[PDB]
Amino acid sequence: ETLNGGITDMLTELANFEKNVSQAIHKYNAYRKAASVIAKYPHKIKSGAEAKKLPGVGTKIAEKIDEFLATGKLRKLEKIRQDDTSSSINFLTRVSGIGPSAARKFVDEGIKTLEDLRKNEDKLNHHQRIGLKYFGDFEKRIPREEMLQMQDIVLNEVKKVDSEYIATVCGSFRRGAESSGDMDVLLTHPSFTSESTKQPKLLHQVVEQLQKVHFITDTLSKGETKFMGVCQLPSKNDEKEYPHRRIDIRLIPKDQYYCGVLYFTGSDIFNKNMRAHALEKGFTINEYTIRPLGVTGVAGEPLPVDSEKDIFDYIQWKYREPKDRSE
DNA sequence: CATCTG
DNA sequence: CAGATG
Ligand SMILES: [Mn+2]
Ligand SMILES: [Mn+2]
Ligand code: NA
Ligand code: NA
């Protein structure tokens, strides 16, 4: 957790670059288990050879830890923190809509910067276009004082469209958090479930409303159950308008809301421990459900939940307010 | 995993 | 449809 920090870190930068710049998925993948392993290792790695000793750790990495250990640096890492081509790919990639794949093409084509992007707004697809447009706003965190306003609005309109909706803003917003990155909303309706054959409007009616009143400003992606957009708090008495916010909306059949809802609320750490214990208590959990575990190895069968309360209950646990869902 | 693009 | 992004 700090006894093997640099090592795990350099390894990461290394790993990272493999996949993002080169295409070295294997390689990249190599750095990972490696940093993951040294990560757990109880001691102070004083040498390469000592490390090699670990699984996932071969010769080359060992060689690396050496030079790193031996000196406060690594050549190859030093060669990379410079290289303009590498730097560009990390940068371009910041644009929502631009992955690495794309990060590469652009650069090869000479687009390495934001200006480069605007100049060639044409090669950019819609999502990317927006991405470019709100680069700034996108990177800005979301102070909960805003969040509360957003939530206020979303909730009023969903309500208006149908009293039967059920919306929930999960995320860290949900877990207390002073500010979040984007707004995730869970959505269900009674008239939509596991079996129930579809009902797209269920999602669209609301999306519409939201833009009806201008909260939603753009659409990143709009499928029948998921919606990726942009929203924005009405700018008051003109002098101070709000940054544009990343927002997602998802239709979930009523019969699996809470597992979902529970799930989205994190934290990852709260998840696993919860899952780990579930396992003990004779169960299984995932994104959508909870199932009574057979002894034959495994087994399923959807245990019925009417709240986060039903779930915990199941695993015979202490109902955790969202705040304490931290770890 | 669900949506988009081409 | 494979392949990219989130
Ligand atoms: Mn988001
Ligand atoms: Mn979020
Ligand atoms: Na990106
Ligand atoms: Na292939």
Side-chain angles (χ1 to χ4, degrees):
Chain A
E1 285 171 284
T2 204
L3 66 196
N4 299 128
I7 280 155
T8 40
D9 304 346
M10 138 226 277
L11 246 34
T12 88
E13 282 210 25
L14 253 339
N16 267 334
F17 154 98
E18 275 323 332
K19 93 136 159 197
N20 281 188
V21 168
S22 18
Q23 190 159 135
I25 156 78
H26 286 314
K27 256 179 198 182
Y28 148 89
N29 222 197
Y31 291 111
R32 75 159 322 190
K33 89 303 202 220
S36 146
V37 345
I38 99 131
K40 297 182 213 163
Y41 187 70
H43 305 294
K44 257 220 169 80
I45 299 178
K46 252 49 179 276
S47 68
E50 189 197 337
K52 207 169 170 325
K53 272 212 179 330
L54 257 5
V57 28
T59 152
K60 275 132 330 75
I61 283 161
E63 174 136 13
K64 263 132 278 174
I65 309 174
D66 275 315
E67 173 186 349
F68 181 84
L69 260 71
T71 131
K73 288 286 234 125
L74 187 79
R75 162 134 191 191
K76 188 191 189 191
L77 220 60
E78 75 161 26
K79 168 161 170 131
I80 287 169
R81 306 190 193 166
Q82 292 184 189
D83 177 34
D84 77 308
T85 284
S86 157
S87 344
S88 301
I89 302 173
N90 305 123
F91 188 89
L92 266 29
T93 261
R94 294 185 22 211
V95 186
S96 180
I98 299 180
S101 156
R104 341 204 188 115
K105 154 203 127 219
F106 283 140
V107 170
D108 290 328
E109 306 195 331
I111 323 199
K112 297 183 199 209
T113 94
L114 244 175
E115 297 203 59
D116 290 358
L117 279 167
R118 328 164 146 116
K119 291 335 214 162
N120 319 268
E121 208 165 346
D122 48 298
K123 344 199 111 138
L124 300 215
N125 80 269
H126 185 73
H127 175 159
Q128 281 158 178
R129 296 207 181 140
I130 300 257
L132 167 52
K133 186 169 153 196
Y134 298 124
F135 195 88
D137 288 344
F138 283 174
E139 298 204 324
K140 290 189 201 86
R141 301 271 317 189
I142 319 198
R144 80 144 50 197
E145 20 275 310
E146 289 185 341
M147 272 292 191
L148 294 194
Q149 301 165 241
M150 320 214 262
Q151 155 194 267
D152 187 58
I153 322 183
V154 191
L155 301 177
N156 308 326
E157 315 292 301
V158 180
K159 186 207 160 75
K160 24 176 300 214
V161 76
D162 192 329
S163 278
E164 232 87 58
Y165 272 117
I166 301 195
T168 279
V169 185
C170 316
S172 37
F173 164 54
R174 182 79 172 2
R175 271 193 328 234
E178 284 268 25
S179 87
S180 338
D182 57 62
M183 152 143 305
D184 312 302
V185 182
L186 270 10
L187 203 61
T188 185
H189 197 268
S191 161
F192 176 60
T193 157
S194 213
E195 300 91 28
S196 97
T197 196
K198 292 319 201 173
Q199 225 214 343
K201 278 326 196 174
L202 272 191
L203 170 63
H204 315 248
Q205 274 180 158
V206 345
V207 168
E208 212 162 52
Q209 189 44 211
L210 277 15
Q211 350 184 213
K212 182 191 159 203
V213 310
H214 309 289
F215 173 82
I216 279 172
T217 63
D218 315 68
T219 316
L220 254 33
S221 75
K222 198 211 340 192
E224 56 190 351
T225 31
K226 203 158 152 180
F227 158 85
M228 258 146 51
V230 187
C231 56
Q232 189 203 33
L233 302 173
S235 310
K236 325 272 196 209
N237 25 160
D238 256 35
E239 272 287 1
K240 84 285 283 269
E241 152 153 336
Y242 289 93
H244 282 88
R245 290 140 179 345
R246 277 299 290 100
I247 185 211
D248 310 349
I249 302 194
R250 62 263 269 212
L251 210 16
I252 316 310
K254 173 129 185 213
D255 75 304
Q256 18 205 221
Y257 201 52
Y258 319 98
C259 292
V261 177
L262 171 77
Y263 176 70
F264 277 105
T265 314
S267 65
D268 312 345
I269 68 261
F270 176 49
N271 276 139
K272 314 163 189 171
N273 278 105
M274 181 126 170
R275 300 176 162 196
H277 173 88
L279 223 323
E280 275 353 282
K281 288 314 139 101
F283 287 117
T284 177
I285 355 271
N286 66 182
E287 25 296 295
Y288 325 86
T289 79
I290 206 195
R291 316 154 306 190
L293 222 26
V295 48
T296 38
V298 324
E301 236 41 21
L303 255 28
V305 193
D306 249 70
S307 191
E308 300 203 286
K309 182 63 186 169
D310 295 310
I311 316 179
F312 280 95
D313 277 353
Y314 284 159
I315 50 170
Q316 48 174 186
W317 238 29
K318 86 151 183 199
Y319 177 24
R320 278 278 171 97
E321 266 216 336
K323 137 272 263 288
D324 45 44
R325 298 234 187 160
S326 301
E327 66 108 34

mmCIF file of all heavy atoms in Angstrom, chain A residues 33-68:
data_model
loop_
_atom_site.group_PDB
_atom_site.id
_atom_site.type_symbol
_atom_site.label_atom_id
_atom_site.label_comp_id
_atom_site.label_asym_id
_atom_site.label_seq_id
_atom_site.Cartn_x
_atom_site.Cartn_y
_atom_site.Cartn_z
ATOM 1 N N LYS A 33 -1.070 -7.571 -13.887
ATOM 2 C CA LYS A 33 -1.077 -8.594 -12.899
ATOM 3 C C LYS A 33 0.141 -8.308 -12.087
ATOM 4 O O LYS A 33 0.066 -8.326 -10.885
ATOM 5 C CB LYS A 33 -1.196 -10.027 -13.384
ATOM 6 C CG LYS A 33 0.118 -10.710 -13.692
ATOM 7 C CD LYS A 33 0.936 -9.948 -14.721
ATOM 8 C CE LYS A 33 1.972 -10.793 -15.447
ATOM 9 N NZ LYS A 33 3.230 -10.061 -15.647
ATOM 10 N N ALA A 34 1.229 -7.945 -12.780
ATOM 11 C CA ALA A 34 2.443 -7.611 -12.066
ATOM 12 C C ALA A 34 2.204 -6.546 -11.015
ATOM 13 O O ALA A 34 2.406 -6.831 -9.829
ATOM 14 C CB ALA A 34 3.647 -7.324 -12.924
ATOM 15 N N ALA A 35 1.766 -5.349 -11.393
ATOM 16 C CA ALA A 35 1.558 -4.394 -10.321
ATOM 17 C C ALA A 35 0.538 -4.846 -9.293
ATOM 18 O O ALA A 35 0.604 -4.478 -8.125
ATOM 19 C CB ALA A 35 1.746 -2.920 -10.605
ATOM 20 N N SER A 36 -0.404 -5.675 -9.759
ATOM 21 C CA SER A 36 -1.409 -6.192 -8.852
ATOM 22 C C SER A 36 -0.763 -7.089 -7.820
ATOM 23 O O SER A 36 -1.106 -7.090 -6.636
ATOM 24 C CB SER A 36 -2.409 -7.105 -9.522
ATOM 25 O OG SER A 36 -2.787 -8.119 -8.581
ATOM 26 N N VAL A 37 0.169 -7.909 -8.290
ATOM 27 C CA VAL A 37 0.824 -8.810 -7.382
ATOM 28 C C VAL A 37 1.741 -8.180 -6.375
ATOM 29 O O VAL A 37 1.634 -8.558 -5.202
ATOM 30 C CB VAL A 37 1.355 -10.123 -7.924
ATOM 31 C CG1 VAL A 37 0.812 -10.462 -9.293
ATOM 32 C CG2 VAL A 37 2.865 -10.257 -7.767
ATOM 33 N N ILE A 38 2.619 -7.264 -6.853
ATOM 34 C CA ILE A 38 3.563 -6.576 -5.965
ATOM 35 C C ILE A 38 2.778 -5.743 -4.952
ATOM 36 O O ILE A 38 3.235 -5.383 -3.864
ATOM 37 C CB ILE A 38 4.740 -5.814 -6.617
ATOM 38 C CG1 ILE A 38 4.452 -4.334 -6.724
ATOM 39 C CG2 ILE A 38 5.107 -6.365 -7.991
ATOM 40 C CD1 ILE A 38 5.628 -3.524 -6.189
ATOM 41 N N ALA A 39 1.555 -5.452 -5.385
ATOM 42 C CA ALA A 39 0.590 -4.688 -4.651
ATOM 43 C C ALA A 39 0.273 -5.343 -3.330
ATOM 44 O O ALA A 39 0.303 -4.688 -2.306
ATOM 45 C CB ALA A 39 -0.652 -4.575 -5.492
ATOM 46 N N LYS A 40 -0.030 -6.637 -3.383
ATOM 47 C CA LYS A 40 -0.351 -7.456 -2.208
ATOM 48 C C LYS A 40 0.901 -7.808 -1.352
ATOM 49 O O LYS A 40 0.854 -7.870 -0.111
ATOM 50 C CB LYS A 40 -1.140 -8.736 -2.551
ATOM 51 C CG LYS A 40 -2.530 -8.564 -3.172
ATOM 52 C CD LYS A 40 -3.208 -9.922 -3.419
ATOM 53 C CE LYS A 40 -4.134 -9.984 -4.642
ATOM 54 N NZ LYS A 40 -4.454 -11.361 -5.093
ATOM 55 N N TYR A 41 2.033 -8.047 -2.033
ATOM 56 C CA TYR A 41 3.289 -8.390 -1.386
ATOM 57 C C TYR A 41 3.632 -7.518 -0.162
ATOM 58 O O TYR A 41 3.893 -6.264 -0.198
ATOM 59 C CB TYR A 41 4.439 -8.570 -2.381
ATOM 60 C CG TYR A 41 5.764 -9.083 -1.847
ATOM 61 C CD1 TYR A 41 5.960 -10.400 -1.400
ATOM 62 C CD2 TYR A 41 6.880 -8.228 -1.831
ATOM 63 C CE1 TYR A 41 7.211 -10.831 -0.938
ATOM 64 C CE2 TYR A 41 8.141 -8.635 -1.373
ATOM 65 C CZ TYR A 41 8.297 -9.943 -0.926
ATOM 66 O OH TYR A 41 9.532 -10.337 -0.481
ATOM 67 N N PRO A 42 3.604 -8.293 0.933
ATOM 68 C CA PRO A 42 3.858 -7.955 2.334
ATOM 69 C C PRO A 42 5.224 -7.353 2.649
ATOM 70 O O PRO A 42 5.453 -6.932 3.798
ATOM 71 C CB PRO A 42 3.932 -9.332 3.009
ATOM 72 C CG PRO A 42 4.186 -10.376 1.924
ATOM 73 C CD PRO A 42 3.683 -9.755 0.637
ATOM 74 N N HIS A 43 6.140 -7.322 1.684
ATOM 75 C CA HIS A 43 7.382 -6.794 2.095
ATOM 76 C C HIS A 43 7.963 -5.698 1.257
ATOM 77 O O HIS A 43 7.368 -5.221 0.323
ATOM 78 C CB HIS A 43 8.339 -8.002 2.114
ATOM 79 C CG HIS A 43 7.927 -9.198 2.950
ATOM 80 N ND1 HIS A 43 7.837 -9.153 4.337
ATOM 81 C CD2 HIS A 43 7.617 -10.465 2.590
ATOM 82 C CE1 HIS A 43 7.476 -10.346 4.771
ATOM 83 N NE2 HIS A 43 7.335 -11.154 3.746
ATOM 84 N N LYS A 44 9.154 -5.312 1.638
ATOM 85 C CA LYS A 44 9.881 -4.306 0.939
ATOM 86 C C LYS A 44 10.790 -4.954 -0.093
ATOM 87 O O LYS A 44 11.844 -5.500 0.211
ATOM 88 C CB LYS A 44 10.628 -3.290 1.777
ATOM 89 C CG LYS A 44 9.875 -1.976 1.808
ATOM 90 C CD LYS A 44 10.772 -0.736 1.716
ATOM 91 C CE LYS A 44 9.995 0.576 1.478
ATOM 92 N NZ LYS A 44 9.374 1.156 2.704
ATOM 93 N N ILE A 45 10.355 -4.891 -1.330
ATOM 94 C CA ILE A 45 11.122 -5.469 -2.384
ATOM 95 C C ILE A 45 12.430 -4.743 -2.499
ATOM 96 O O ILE A 45 12.490 -3.582 -2.851
ATOM 97 C CB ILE A 45 10.355 -5.432 -3.676
ATOM 98 C CG1 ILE A 45 9.059 -6.239 -3.500
ATOM 99 C CG2 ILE A 45 11.247 -6.055 -4.723
ATOM 100 C CD1 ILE A 45 8.130 -6.272 -4.699
ATOM 101 N N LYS A 46 13.489 -5.422 -2.186
ATOM 102 C CA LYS A 46 14.773 -4.783 -2.255
ATOM 103 C C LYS A 46 15.512 -5.086 -3.526
ATOM 104 O O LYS A 46 16.588 -4.555 -3.833
ATOM 105 C CB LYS A 46 15.616 -5.049 -1.021
ATOM 106 C CG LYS A 46 15.796 -3.870 -0.076
ATOM 107 C CD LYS A 46 14.517 -3.159 0.291
ATOM 108 C CE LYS A 46 14.778 -2.015 1.263
ATOM 109 N NZ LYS A 46 14.852 -2.455 2.674
ATOM 110 N N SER A 47 14.946 -5.951 -4.300
ATOM 111 C CA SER A 47 15.617 -6.263 -5.521
ATOM 112 C C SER A 47 14.679 -6.872 -6.537
ATOM 113 O O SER A 47 13.522 -7.296 -6.273
ATOM 114 C CB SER A 47 16.775 -7.222 -5.288
ATOM 115 O OG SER A 47 16.283 -8.511 -4.900
ATOM 116 N N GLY A 48 15.228 -6.922 -7.729
ATOM 117 C CA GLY A 48 14.510 -7.464 -8.839
ATOM 118 C C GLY A 48 14.300 -8.919 -8.625
ATOM 119 O O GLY A 48 13.155 -9.385 -8.586
ATOM 120 N N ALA A 49 15.437 -9.578 -8.487
ATOM 121 C CA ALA A 49 15.434 -10.996 -8.278
ATOM 122 C C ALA A 49 14.414 -11.430 -7.228
ATOM 123 O O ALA A 49 13.768 -12.457 -7.296
ATOM 124 C CB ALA A 49 16.824 -11.333 -7.840
ATOM 125 N N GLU A 50 14.278 -10.596 -6.244
ATOM 126 C CA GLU A 50 13.368 -10.826 -5.175
ATOM 127 C C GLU A 50 11.996 -10.803 -5.686
ATOM 128 O O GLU A 50 11.106 -11.505 -5.225
ATOM 129 C CB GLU A 50 13.449 -9.743 -4.095
ATOM 130 C CG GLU A 50 12.619 -10.141 -2.853
ATOM 131 C CD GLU A 50 12.335 -8.979 -1.944
ATOM 132 O OE1 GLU A 50 13.209 -7.986 -2.085
ATOM 133 O OE2 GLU A 50 11.348 -8.947 -1.207
ATOM 134 N N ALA A 51 11.818 -9.930 -6.630
ATOM 135 C CA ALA A 51 10.504 -9.772 -7.198
ATOM 136 C C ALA A 51 10.061 -10.871 -8.147
ATOM 137 O O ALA A 51 8.933 -11.398 -8.053
ATOM 138 C CB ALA A 51 10.311 -8.364 -7.735
ATOM 139 N N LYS A 52 11.005 -11.212 -9.047
ATOM 140 C CA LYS A 52 10.892 -12.211 -10.089
ATOM 141 C C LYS A 52 10.210 -13.388 -9.492
ATOM 142 O O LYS A 52 9.363 -14.075 -10.074
ATOM 143 C CB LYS A 52 12.262 -12.583 -10.559
ATOM 144 C CG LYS A 52 12.248 -13.056 -11.972
ATOM 145 C CD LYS A 52 13.655 -13.155 -12.496
ATOM 146 C CE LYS A 52 13.661 -13.855 -13.841
ATOM 147 N NZ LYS A 52 12.638 -14.924 -13.943
ATOM 148 N N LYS A 53 10.617 -13.559 -8.259
ATOM 149 C CA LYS A 53 10.138 -14.564 -7.392
ATOM 150 C C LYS A 53 8.621 -14.598 -7.394
ATOM 151 O O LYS A 53 7.969 -15.580 -7.049
ATOM 152 C CB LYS A 53 10.508 -14.132 -6.000
ATOM 153 C CG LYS A 53 11.864 -14.561 -5.542
ATOM 154 C CD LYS A 53 11.825 -14.786 -4.042
ATOM 155 C CE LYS A 53 13.183 -15.240 -3.568
ATOM 156 N NZ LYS A 53 13.888 -15.992 -4.630
ATOM 157 N N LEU A 54 8.047 -13.497 -7.755
ATOM 158 C CA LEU A 54 6.643 -13.461 -7.780
ATOM 159 C C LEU A 54 6.117 -13.987 -9.115
ATOM 160 O O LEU A 54 6.800 -14.075 -10.154
ATOM 161 C CB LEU A 54 6.255 -12.012 -7.593
ATOM 162 C CG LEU A 54 5.755 -11.606 -6.205
ATOM 163 C CD1 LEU A 54 5.836 -12.733 -5.198
ATOM 164 C CD2 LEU A 54 6.630 -10.452 -5.756
ATOM 165 N N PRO A 55 4.861 -14.349 -9.080
ATOM 166 C CA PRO A 55 4.180 -14.835 -10.243
ATOM 167 C C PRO A 55 3.801 -13.584 -11.019
ATOM 168 O O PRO A 55 3.509 -12.538 -10.457
ATOM 169 C CB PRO A 55 2.910 -15.546 -9.750
ATOM 170 C CG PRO A 55 3.008 -15.608 -8.237
ATOM 171 C CD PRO A 55 4.355 -15.004 -7.852
ATOM 172 N N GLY A 56 3.801 -13.692 -12.320
ATOM 173 C CA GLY A 56 3.473 -12.561 -13.128
ATOM 174 C C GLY A 56 4.757 -11.805 -13.380
ATOM 175 O O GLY A 56 4.832 -10.986 -14.288
ATOM 176 N N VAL A 57 5.783 -12.104 -12.559
ATOM 177 C CA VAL A 57 7.044 -11.454 -12.697
ATOM 178 C C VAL A 57 8.158 -12.211 -13.285
ATOM 179 O O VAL A 57 8.761 -13.120 -12.740
ATOM 180 C CB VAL A 57 7.416 -10.349 -11.747
ATOM 181 C CG1 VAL A 57 6.747 -10.523 -10.399
ATOM 182 C CG2 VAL A 57 8.889 -10.470 -11.519
ATOM 183 N N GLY A 58 8.418 -11.788 -14.462
ATOM 184 C CA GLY A 58 9.448 -12.354 -15.231
ATOM 185 C C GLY A 58 10.621 -11.427 -15.268
ATOM 186 O O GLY A 58 10.673 -10.407 -14.586
ATOM 187 N N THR A 59 11.534 -11.860 -16.127
ATOM 188 C CA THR A 59 12.816 -11.268 -16.430
ATOM 189 C C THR A 59 12.865 -9.773 -16.708
ATOM 190 O O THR A 59 13.589 -9.029 -16.058
ATOM 191 C CB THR A 59 13.715 -12.252 -17.288
ATOM 192 O OG1 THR A 59 14.675 -11.662 -18.161
ATOM 193 C CG2 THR A 59 12.874 -13.297 -18.021
ATOM 194 N N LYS A 60 12.076 -9.347 -17.684
ATOM 195 C CA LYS A 60 12.006 -7.973 -18.110
ATOM 196 C C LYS A 60 11.487 -7.021 -17.092
ATOM 197 O O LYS A 60 12.000 -5.923 -16.901
ATOM 198 C CB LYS A 60 11.371 -7.829 -19.454
ATOM 199 C CG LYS A 60 12.456 -8.036 -20.488
ATOM 200 C CD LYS A 60 12.081 -8.988 -21.606
ATOM 201 C CE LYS A 60 11.092 -10.043 -21.141
ATOM 202 N NZ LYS A 60 9.745 -9.493 -20.995
ATOM 203 N N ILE A 61 10.463 -7.436 -16.431
ATOM 204 C CA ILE A 61 9.954 -6.570 -15.443
ATOM 205 C C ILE A 61 10.987 -6.478 -14.339
ATOM 206 O O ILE A 61 11.260 -5.409 -13.799
ATOM 207 C CB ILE A 61 8.719 -7.176 -14.869
ATOM 208 C CG1 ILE A 61 7.597 -6.949 -15.888
ATOM 209 C CG2 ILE A 61 8.481 -6.583 -13.449
ATOM 210 C CD1 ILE A 61 6.395 -7.887 -15.688
ATOM 211 N N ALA A 62 11.526 -7.640 -14.008
ATOM 212 C CA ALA A 62 12.517 -7.722 -12.985
ATOM 213 C C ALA A 62 13.621 -6.722 -13.337
ATOM 214 O O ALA A 62 14.017 -5.890 -12.538
ATOM 215 C CB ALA A 62 12.994 -9.171 -12.834
ATOM 216 N N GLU A 63 14.054 -6.773 -14.569
ATOM 217 C CA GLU A 63 15.061 -5.881 -15.039
ATOM 218 C C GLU A 63 14.715 -4.416 -14.814
ATOM 219 O O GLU A 63 15.565 -3.532 -14.560
ATOM 220 C CB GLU A 63 15.223 -6.127 -16.527
ATOM 221 C CG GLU A 63 16.178 -5.113 -17.142
ATOM 222 C CD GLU A 63 17.107 -5.812 -18.068
ATOM 223 O OE1 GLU A 63 16.698 -7.047 -18.332
ATOM 224 O OE2 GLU A 63 18.154 -5.305 -18.457
ATOM 225 N N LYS A 64 13.430 -4.171 -14.952
ATOM 226 C CA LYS A 64 12.912 -2.848 -14.793
ATOM 227 C C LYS A 64 12.944 -2.384 -13.358
ATOM 228 O O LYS A 64 13.420 -1.330 -13.060
ATOM 229 C CB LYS A 64 11.611 -2.625 -15.568
ATOM 230 C CG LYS A 64 11.862 -1.948 -16.925
ATOM 231 C CD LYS A 64 11.179 -2.580 -18.136
ATOM 232 C CE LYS A 64 11.962 -3.772 -18.681
ATOM 233 N NZ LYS A 64 11.271 -4.500 -19.757
ATOM 234 N N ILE A 65 12.432 -3.210 -12.481
ATOM 235 C CA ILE A 65 12.401 -2.897 -11.074
ATOM 236 C C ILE A 65 13.805 -2.645 -10.649
ATOM 237 O O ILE A 65 14.066 -1.873 -9.759
ATOM 238 C CB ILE A 65 11.775 -4.000 -10.206
ATOM 239 C CG1 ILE A 65 10.444 -4.408 -10.763
ATOM 240 C CG2 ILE A 65 11.536 -3.539 -8.782
ATOM 241 C CD1 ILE A 65 9.838 -5.596 -10.016
ATOM 242 N N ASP A 66 14.715 -3.309 -11.304
ATOM 243 C CA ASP A 66 16.062 -3.088 -10.902
ATOM 244 C C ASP A 66 16.535 -1.662 -11.031
ATOM 245 O O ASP A 66 16.866 -1.008 -10.053
ATOM 246 C CB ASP A 66 17.068 -4.253 -11.074
ATOM 247 C CG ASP A 66 17.090 -5.260 -9.897
ATOM 248 O OD1 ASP A 66 17.098 -4.940 -8.705
ATOM 249 O OD2 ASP A 66 17.127 -6.523 -10.273
ATOM 250 N N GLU A 67 16.515 -1.206 -12.266
ATOM 251 C CA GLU A 67 16.905 0.128 -12.685
ATOM 252 C C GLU A 67 16.118 1.146 -11.928
ATOM 253 O O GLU A 67 16.589 2.208 -11.594
ATOM 254 C CB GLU A 67 16.639 0.286 -14.185
ATOM 255 C CG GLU A 67 16.855 1.701 -14.748
ATOM 256 C CD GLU A 67 16.434 1.755 -16.193
ATOM 257 O OE1 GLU A 67 16.198 0.555 -16.706
ATOM 258 O OE2 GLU A 67 16.306 2.794 -16.809
ATOM 259 N N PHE A 68 14.895 0.818 -11.665
ATOM 260 C CA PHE A 68 14.096 1.746 -10.926
ATOM 261 C C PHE A 68 14.612 1.802 -9.521
ATOM 262 O O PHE A 68 14.805 2.846 -8.929
ATOM 263 C CB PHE A 68 12.679 1.260 -10.814
ATOM 264 C CG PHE A 68 11.877 2.252 -10.066
ATOM 265 C CD1 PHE A 68 11.318 3.357 -10.706
ATOM 266 C CD2 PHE A 68 11.652 2.096 -8.703
ATOM 267 C CE1 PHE A 68 10.543 4.288 -10.013
ATOM 268 C CE2 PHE A 68 10.877 3.018 -7.997
ATOM 269 C CZ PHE A 68 10.321 4.115 -8.649
#
